[PDB]
Design a protein around this ligand. Structure first.
Ligand SMILES: [K+]
Lengths: 74, 74
């Protein structure tokens, strides 16, 4: 009973963390992918701003990933 | 007992996957920012290749993120 229920609680918190953590990664990515696809469709007048925003989200994502890497040890 | 053992083994496998996914995301993020910098500095030609490389890295990152989401549900 008790060890299984605590282990299951611990495992469920790990699932929910991975779900939240991954959706958080999803949002910068969808921007990176969308802005690159806008370019391939012919729609970019200013690839400088497009690239800047891409770079911004890549950096944001990099901070999320380093924090995951650390949190996975805890 | 056996029920805690499997909750824990399941949790530990999820933990290892976070780690491995997070490392695998770190690299495309590095590629995108390294290539962006080279292009901004005048060191490369064919911005269409830059944007297509970013699209490919982003789609690979999307696959890793969806793996995490699926693993959390299974
Ligand atoms: K933990």
């Amino acid at each position: 009973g008790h060890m299984a229920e605590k282990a299951r609680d611990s495992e469920d918190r790990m699932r929910q963390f991975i779900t939240d953590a991954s959706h958080e990664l999803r949002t910068p990515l969808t921007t990176i992918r969308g802005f690159a696809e806008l370019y391939r469709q012919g729609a970019a007048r200013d690839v400088g701003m497009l690239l800047s925003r891409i770079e911004s989200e890549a950096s944001r994502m990099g901070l999320l990933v380093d924090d995951l890497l650390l949190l996975a040890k805890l």
